[PDB]
Ligand binder design. Structure first.
Ligand SMILES: Nc1ncnc2c1ncn2[C@@H]1O[C@H](COP(=O)(O)OP(=O)(O)O)[C@@H](O)[C@H]1O
Ligand SMILES: Nc1ncnc2c1ncn2[C@@H]1O[C@H](COP(=O)(O)OP(=O)(O)O)[C@@H](O)[C@H]1O
Ligand code: BEF
Ligand code: BEF
Lengths: 140, 636, 310, 111, 620, 113
């Protein structure tokens, strides 16, 4: 009977609590350091605005529709804020919590990316949209 | 003649031993002081039960800690029994004597109180952080005194005339200049929460902030009534008097989880080793579950509501590492530091009971099929690992398994239901393993077994190859795999003549195949398991399963030398019903030396090798064969 | 006098040469500006490095608030169709020059190298003389006004015009244009959709009115033979509207077009069990698929007899 | 007049109780079917000590014996029927606060 | 008014503390008495250096043990210095009075004495196993005396008339009724070997005399005066192997944390390595030649588990039981120094360009596991790896030599990962690289992928795989237009087959590394390669939920020179939708996906397509 | 006359020496550029105590200070250069039997985290 002798890995998965409007109300331990932005400041204040960059907050909606029909938002990529004005990419799924009969809150599983990952995932991002002509490119 | 002496003690070096050798962490002085104050509170409460005249000077019971950042003093204030002059002299000025132990020896039997400490060396841990110490004390039998010392051989006891205390004790600690970190509040909160969270009395602290107050900005620095013991223990309550939300609240406090638990087990044991435990199964399996070799800290251990240790490895087996809870007791043999449990053979006895009660929790949860699926989809790998690890409780641990089968749709199904759904003639149970369900469903191996109307289990995870080296039987049933040599379907008595006839017909062709595929196979025999495909390849009876070879060729740290020892022993079988075999024998009989026959048999072997659970050597030649095929297909 | 005063109060020195002809088209938000230009260096002997006739396509412009640098928007209002003069841009009005210069050279006609002049000029952002060749200014609302011109209320009512016109062209037999305009309607409805919160009721309402347009656009590709476009659009649609009928018929037809018999039959079963008693055409399709498969197999692919003739 | 401290444990056939008295004078210990009485006078302070405990199950007054060293008094009690596990020492389930199990040489003999 | 009292402590509770809560093992009484005897011998030696007459009563400095099962009294004797009556009262009959510590502080200079006992408790451990303890002693300045107690508050001191000891001490232990296990010579020998092996004086055992601590410590001796045979004998006596040690390192660190370390590399790796998981005792820590603790994973990292040896110190803090260091921080320094010296032992062993192979073949897996784990020593372990190449033939060669063989335009190190060398040496991936005369690396072991995950660079040169995308080979201008024009005359077919697949390949381009094959499959720039994913999906403890977070895309590439793709392109031009085109493209994809190492899901699809082709071609 | 038992350790800037003399009377300490002297009447039996040290490097006598507590005399010394590492306290290499390292305050200030 051969044993199990595989070397364990150092994966960096971390979770956060999002409310029904996707806004957070807290983060767990590994998030306290990977993001570095301690519990209390995101729990009470959270800057008032979204922790998702605007160029990616439109891509949260497509995840949400799956999340509300079945429960899982699928594999999506955002851009969190960090304390040093940083930008830490994430690969993320979401699960919503049912109270009696009805939703209660949202907890999500996220994996960080080094910024090269984000650049390569973004260079393709800005072209894969079935919109109209950008002739005379004024604004997005 | 003989002369008799009494054992003595050198006080200076005994002090040095206490302050230098006993205690490794310097943050346990607060644990000891808090425990002392709690014991003093227990005494006054127990004496006030009989006649409340004793409780006429101060009704509340509380512990107060006052940092004094300017004056570098940490102060405890306690509203307990206090000590008189003689008590001060005999108790705090004599090492190894404790009045708590004498009290527990003195009271009438059957009293409902449990006070901490019987060593009598706990107080002197304060010098690990303090230069000199002041103990101002008030008791109901005499006036208010002040006990002064600096651990240097002597101490001074004086009458005090400050402001009244009413009743209780006040330990003032003048901190040494290198430990001035036990004044900021992060550290005191951390220490109190980690060590003395579940003391049975309120613990109060003073946070000197400034609030934005208005009725032109005024800075009003003030003293906050703060406290640090919001959560009570619940394992000290009747297991029936608790609702299912009190448990959830306590679990959320204990593990800092976000959702409530999935199942809570509350139990107590009686005997020489007595303890009461709560065990929580979390709904969602924790990420970073099988990586942390050091800080798993799943199960904590308490003694009389005082933290002892968290990361023992004989407390629980490593296949139950997701179970989180607390274990508390009354009479464990602590060591002089109250951080390690003497003679750790007790941990085996604790572990046995924890294991058996967790198995009982799994079985009880198995009745509510509405929520057992969520437990399986999070800890199936844990249960299979458990099957692979221990042998004593193998049976019931295997009984909890769920699998997909031949006709189960999208619903996992157990083994007992499979035995219920079994044909009356079935001698054995059929299983198959692979990377995905879709791969093993359309496997050529099981096509005839499925058509004849049999029901076959699907294992899909790599841990299943370890799970099937020990599942020899389930309810006295022989588990056999369709990918081996001797797949034994129920012998009908009508097809036996056909089988032997075709055996005679194709012995020649099997021998012809055996001599062209030299050392690529071990023998070419006749099949009884293919109905819709030409020849397939299977594995021997005492060798690694074709999928076990794939898994064993992935252990990074494994030794390579013994690879040819357990190496597979492949077998090629014959479909006598596909037109390939018919034309193959027809060409063979008229010519034993053709090129087309050799090329086609090599191609069939090398294309059925992929269909099984095997990996081609030198795949470029297979690709080149198909390349010459495509080229001739386009005519070049 | 305010025109003349404001012209010369803002670093601009222009002399009236000749006035034009005709009424003033609207310069409001959504106004179109199609024109050429010529650029002259102020002190480098007027070296014409930038010029529209060297590239061959006239650059457009967005007069309203959508586009940036209101200096261009102001100077366009100064002239009119056929009216051309010399301009002299102030230093403060050329401060962010290279940022736009590289963007417009990249967005020139469009491929789908290296330029030392551009990065050197990036080192020195400097004003130039743009002798802009004005062609004409159009008026919003007075023609097939551009989809991005208005503020979603004109489109909200305009889209039915496009839908009806596309239907009329289709039943006449014009297919490429119908597909184009259905795409344009889908595009305006989509960037409408991307303004309001998902999970809102009007969100689902919008999706409901846009779905038939998406099916209509998917229709023409079947004449156009890009069956994979049909697959991509239908499979996107049906993840959430599980109970449509043509949203099954079209992708079944497409599947059967490219020899995907298995999924073709699988889809046809569902479209029958949502729309019973409508067998005939489905039978035609299924048996045409089977006969074409058999025909190809019998003659064309039986060529392989030689693969083992040796 | 006051009960003395005690530590105890058990094995396959024996129940061992140790009374933590020092410098014991003229100890008396008597054995019957279900009771054990221990009497001493310890220390120069001359404080009397008496312990009367009813037993959880019957023991053997014949095979049982005691030994006075100095540090303590040792009592050997052979069970009335071997193999019988003792979850406790007395009959009543209330916790006699002067008694505790000795874990320095405890053993989980029923493995 | 003020009142000062003498700060006190009572004896009964303190003795109960010592007996009951200090020591958890009943076997360490022997460790305590042996240490006391060794100190007593050191005293009588030191007083004899500067006064030869002190040994006129006895000359040999030895220790005996006299187990006696006829009457259960274990006896321990020695010929040390002894005690006087005043010493008996003032040294034994006091809880925290250490005679040894008072002897130490009264040494006239920096003499050659290093004694063990300092706490003054520890002699009382004799009551863990004995009911009554007697001590018969004689000191050179007075008469032989007896000492008796039961740890019950009083001890007696009598003049003696028995058989004279001559000089020294005799500590006698009347063992407890239920502890008659320490009279068995198995138990005594086991305890002595574990705890008091390397003591500085001979220890015998009267059953018929026989000596226990035969082997002497060599880490104290100057390591310029040891011959390899001595090291070999010590290694054999320490590890029980009958082979010699391959290498040895014997260094020392001076300062606040002073210690001598002596390290060994066994000749052959143990067969139960990585698997035992029960005991990891390979580096034993000693303090003044008395065992303290085995390696509880703080002394040495896991990837150096094969190292064996000792660590000895003269000043380290110990808890009361003398079984554990008082500070965890100490172990961090010890670990840092021991790792730093091990990585120099390896480098010195690597200079012998022949014996290094016999070490690599044994512990390359451990070095690679270290490269995975140890993030601070990666730049030093990367120079201890040896790999097959496309030019070394049957020899394993370095990476520094690879840099010393790199062409004038070569800029990076090319590597491939597979499962057998004969297969990776002919794959479609390396055909063009072998054409331009470059050298690739055949890392063909499962741990190689883990190593490459972390390495990412070496000597300013960066590892680049041929199985990834966008491989950039230094190449001239003539091809620079051939490749571009080939991409310009293959847009149609590339897009057409990409959309034929449309779900299982992310993108389709023109290849850059094929000569004889028409197509192959490469993974994305990041995420798992083919082999890494093949290995990860077979772990049995892989977290199934987080596969997608670590997956990678696919890429199909086309060799324009191959006749089959040229003819296919010719066909697809005349008809954008031929069924032959779709069928044959799907077949090419399946064949290339099997060639590139991936596991192909639904293999019966591929098998049945081949089967049907055989059907029709064969003429059925 | 014998030297008093002493313990020592160091930080980045300061070297600490604690002379374990209980109930010290008439404590007198002397500081110099590379020299340290300590004397007291220790305990109640009135034995004398004198410790003489040749400092391993230069200290600042104006900045160093000694504060006596009832249990022991603690001295705090400033180094001549902020950051230099002291493997030992004396100039000579011979081990002294009245000096040992205070492992309950020792720390690696060189490799901070
Ligand atoms: N804060 C306090 N208030 C009142 N009495 C106390 C307090 N602290 C200690 N005592 C008494 O003084 C004695 C000091 O002993 P201590 O060092 O606490 O050892 P232990 O913790 O084993 O009791 C105790 O027996 C207790 O009865
Ligand atoms: N065999 C012996 N000969 C001489 N002295 C002894 C012997 N055994 C113990 N001692 C004395 O025991 C005294 C201290 O008791 P112990 O607990 O052994 O101290 P330590 O911690 O120093 O070992 C020391 O005086 C030492 O001299
Ligand atoms: F807090 Be004491 F040690 F019981
Ligand atoms: F042998 Be002693 F306890 F140092």
């Amino acid at each position: 009977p051969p044993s199990i002798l595989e070397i364990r890995t150092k994966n960096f998965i971390f979770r956060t609590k999002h409310k029904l409007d996707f806004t957070p109300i807290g983060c767990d331990a590994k998030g306290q350091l990977i993001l570095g932005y301690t519990e209390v400041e995101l729990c009470t204040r959270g800057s008032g605005y979204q922790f998702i960059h605007a160029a990616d907050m439109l891509h949260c909606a497509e995840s949400h529709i799956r999340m509300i029909k079945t429960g899982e938002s699928g594999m999506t990529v955002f851009r969190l804020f960090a304390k040093h004005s940083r930008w830490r990419w994430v690969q993320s799924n979401a699960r919503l919590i049912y109270r009696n009969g009805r939703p209660d809150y949202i907890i999500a599983t996220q994996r960080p990316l080094t910024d090269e990952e984000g650049r390569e995932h973004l260079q393709k991002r800005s072209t894969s949209l079935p919109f109209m002509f950008a002739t005379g490119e004024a604004v997005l | 003649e003989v002369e008799t002496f009494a054992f003595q003690a050198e006080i200076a070096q005994l002090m040095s031993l206490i302050i230098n050798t006993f205690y490794s962490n310097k943050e346990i002085f607060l644990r000891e002081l808090i425990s002392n104050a709690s014991d003093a509170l227990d005494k006054i409460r127990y004496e006030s039960l009989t006649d409340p005249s004793k409780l006429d000077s101060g009704k509340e019971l509380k512990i107060d800690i006052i940092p004094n950042p300017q004056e570098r003093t940490l102060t405890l204030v306690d509203t307990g029994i206090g000590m008189t002059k003689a008590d001060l002299i005999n108790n705090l000025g004599t090492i190894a004597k404790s009045g708590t132990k004498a009290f527990m020896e003195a009271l009438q039997a059957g009293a409902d109180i449990s006070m901490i400490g019987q060593f009598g060396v706990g107080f002197y841990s304060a010098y690990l952080v303090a230069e000199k110490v002041v103990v101002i004390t008030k008791h109901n039998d005499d006036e208010q005194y002040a006990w002064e010392s600096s651990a240097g051989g002597s101490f001074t006891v004086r009458a005090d005339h400050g402001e009244p205390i009413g009743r209780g004790t006040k330990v003032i600690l003048h901190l040494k200049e290198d430990q001035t970190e036990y004044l900021e509040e992060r550290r005191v909160k951390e220490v109190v929460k980690k060590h003395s969270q579940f003391i049975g009395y309120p613990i109060t602290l003073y946070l000197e902030k400034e609030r934005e107050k208005e009725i032109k900005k005024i800075k009003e620095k003030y003293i906050d009534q703060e406290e640090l013991n919001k959560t009570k223990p619940i394992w000290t309550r009747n297991p029936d008097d608790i609702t299912q939300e009190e448990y959830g609240e306590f679990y959320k406090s204990l593990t800092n989880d976000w959702e409530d638990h999935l199942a809570v087990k509350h139990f107590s044991v009686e005997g020489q080793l007595e303890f009461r435990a709560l065990l929580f199964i979390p709904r969602r399996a924790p990420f970073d579950l099988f990586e942390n070799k050091k800080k798993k800290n799943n199960i904590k251990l308490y003694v009389r509501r005082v933290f002892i240790m968290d990361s023992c490895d004989e407390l629980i087996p490593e296949y139950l590492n997701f179970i989180r809870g607390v274990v508390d007791s009354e009479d464990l043999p602590l060591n002089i530091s109250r951080e390690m449990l003497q003679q750790s053979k007790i941990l085996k006895v604790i572990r046995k009971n924890i294991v058996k009660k967790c198995l009982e929790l799994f079985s009880e949860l198995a009745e509510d099929k509405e929520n057992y699926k969520k437990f399986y989809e999070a800890f199936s790998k844990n249960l299979k690992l458990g099957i692979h690890e221990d042998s004593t409780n193998r049976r019931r641990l295997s009984e909890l398994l769920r699998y997909h089968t031949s006709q189960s749709g999208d619903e996992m199904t157990s083994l007992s239901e499979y035995v219920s759904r079994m044909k009356e003639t079935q001698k054995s149970i059929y299983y198959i393993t692979g990377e995905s369900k879709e791969q093993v469903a359309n496997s050529a191996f099981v096509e005839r077994v499925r058509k004849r109307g049999f029901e076959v289990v699907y294992m899909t995870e790599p841990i299943d190859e370890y799970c099937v080296q020990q599942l020899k039987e389930f309810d006295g049933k022989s588990l056999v795999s369709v990918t081996k040599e001797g797949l034994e379907l129920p012998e009908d008595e009508e097809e036996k003549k056909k089988m032997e006839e075709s055996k005679a017909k194709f012995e020649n062709l099997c021998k012809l195949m055996k001599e062209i595929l030299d050392k690529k196979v071990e023998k070419v025999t006749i099949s009884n398991r293919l109905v819709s495909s030409p020849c397939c390849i299977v594995t021997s009876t005492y060798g690694w399963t074709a999928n076990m070879e794939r898994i064993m060729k992935a252990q990074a740290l494994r030794d390579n030398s013994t690879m040819g020892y357990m190496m597979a022993k492949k077998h090629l079988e014959i479909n006598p019903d596909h037109p390939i075999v018919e034309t193959l024998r027809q060409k063979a009989e008229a010519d034993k030396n053709d090129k087309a026959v050799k090329d086609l048999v090599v191609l069939l072997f090398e294309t059925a090798l992929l269909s099984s659970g095997f990996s081609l050597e030198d795949p470029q030649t297979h690709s080149n064969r198909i390349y010459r095929m495509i080229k001739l297909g386009l005519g070049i | 006098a305010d025109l003349i005063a404001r012209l010369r109060e803002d670093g601009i020195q222009k002399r009236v040469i000749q006035e034009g002809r005709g009424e003033l088209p609207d310069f409001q938000d959504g106004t179109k500006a199609t024109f050429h230009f010529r650029t002259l260096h102020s002190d480098n002997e007027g070296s014409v490095i930038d010029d529209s006739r060297t590239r061959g396509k006239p650059m457009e412009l967005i007069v309203g608030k959508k586009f940036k640098l209101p200096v261009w928007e102001t100077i366009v209002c100064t002239m009119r169709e056929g009216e051309i003069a010399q301009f002299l841009c102030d230093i403060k009005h050329v401060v962010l020059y290279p940022l736009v210069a590289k963007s417009l050279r990249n967005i020139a006609e469009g491929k789908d190298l290296g330029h030392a002049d551009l990065d050197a000029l990036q080192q020195n952002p400097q004003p130039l003389i743009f002798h802009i060749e004005m062609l004409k200014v159009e008026s919003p609302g007075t023609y097939q006004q551009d989809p991005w011109a208005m503020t979603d209320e004109e489109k909200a009512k305009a889209v039915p015009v496009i839908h009806q016109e596309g239907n009329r062209l289709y039943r006449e037999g014009q297919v490429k244009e119908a597909a184009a305009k259905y795409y344009d309607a889908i595009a305006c409805l989509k960037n409408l959709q991307m303004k309001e919160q998902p999970g809102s009721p009007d969100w689902i309402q919008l999706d409901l009115q846009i779905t038939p347009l998406l099916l209509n656009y998917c229709q023409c590709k079947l004449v156009a033979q890009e069956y994979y476009e049909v697959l991509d659009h239908c499979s996107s649609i049906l993840n959430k509207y599980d109970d449509n009928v043509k949203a099954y018929f079209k992708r079944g037809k497409a599947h059967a077009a490219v020899w995907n018999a298995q999924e073709a039959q699988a889809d046809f079963a569902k479209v029958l069990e949502l729309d019973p008693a409508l067998a005939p055409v489905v039978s035609r399709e299924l048996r045409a698929l089977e006969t074409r498969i058999r025909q190809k197999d019998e003659e064309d692919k039986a060529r392989f007899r030689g693969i083992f003739s040796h | 007049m006051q009960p003395a401290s005690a530590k105890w444990y058990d094995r396959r056939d024996y129940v061992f109780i140790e009374f933590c008295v020092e410098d014991s004078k003229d100890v008396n210990v008597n054995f019957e079917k279900s009771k054990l009485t221990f009497s001493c006078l310890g220390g120069s302070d001359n404080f009397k000590h008496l312990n009367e405990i009813d037993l959880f199950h019957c023991i053997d007054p014949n095979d049982s014996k005691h030994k006075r060293t100095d540090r303590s008094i040792l009592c050997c009690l052979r069970k009335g029927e071997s193999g019988q596990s003792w979850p406790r020492l007395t009959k009543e389930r209330a916790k006699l606060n002067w008694l505790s199990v000795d874990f320095n040489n405890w053993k989980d003999w029923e493995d």
